[PDB]
Amino acid sequence: VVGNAAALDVFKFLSLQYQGKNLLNWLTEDSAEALQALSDNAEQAREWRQAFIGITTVKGAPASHSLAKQLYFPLPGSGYHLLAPLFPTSLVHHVHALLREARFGDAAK
RNA sequence: CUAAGAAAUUCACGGCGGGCUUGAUGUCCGCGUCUACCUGGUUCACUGCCGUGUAGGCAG
């Protein structure tokens, strides 16, 4: 999770729908699993569901920066696609977990 | 049209003081190395060489 790190309680509340449920970790479907705890009006329920779905979405516009490592890749006989590679945070956290399994812990030691 | 394009790491400094490495010792026994060969351009179209001077008597 990336952003202002003072609202970590909201991500903690939205991060319990997969540890024993089918409405927060599986909130892409299951409208019964979405309405299983709301009990409020339909407008406030729809606004809360939209706000909960907008936690793994875009920031507002597709925007790069002048300090963001853009590149040209050449096509077979034609012009170009511009390529803006990003940093794989998830993959490198997976590989840091695998390297601490392989270098440290208790069994490898 | 390249994880694209940019970039001052800087100043200064006491490593010192001491010290027993010792004692002992079997390297031994044995053996088939043969077979054959042209250094022959002028080891200079040259060192001493009538003129060093494409002319010459020139240990040719």
Curated annotation (Swiss-Prot):
Phenotype seen when the gene is deleted: Mutants lose phage DMS3 infection-dependent inhibition of biofilm formation while there is normal biofilm formation in the absence of phage infection. Decreased production of crRNA in the presence or absence of phage. Disruption of the entire Y.pestis-subtype CRISPR region disrupts crRNA production but does not alter phage resistance (possibly OLNs PA14_33350 to PA14_33310, and the flanking CRISPR loci), indicating this CRISPR is not involved in phage resistance.
Stretch forming the signal peptide: none
Further remarks about this protein from its record: In this bacteria, Y.pestis-subtype CRISPRs do not confer resistance to phage DMS3 or MP22, but instead are required for DMS3 infection-dependent inhibition of biofilm formation and possibly motility.
Subunit field text: Interacts directly with Csy2; part of the Csy ribonucleoprotein complex with a probable stoichiometry of Csy1(1),Csy2(1),Csy3(6),Cas6/Csy4(1)-crRNA(1). A Csy3(6),Cas6/Csy4(1)-crRNA(1) subcomplex is also formed.
Function comment: CRISPR (clustered regularly interspaced short palindromic repeat) is an adaptive immune system that provides protection against mobile genetic elements (viruses, transposable elements and conjugative plasmids). CRISPR clusters contain sequences complementary to antecedent mobile elements and target invading nucleic acids. CRISPR clusters are transcribed and processed into CRISPR RNA (crRNA). Cas3 and Cascade participate in CRISPR interference, the third stage of CRISPR immunity (Potential). Involved in crRNA production or stability.
Family in the record: Belongs to the CRISPR-associated Csy1 family.
UniProt name for this protein: CRISPR-associated protein Csy1
First-to-last residue of the parent protein present: 108 to 216 of 434
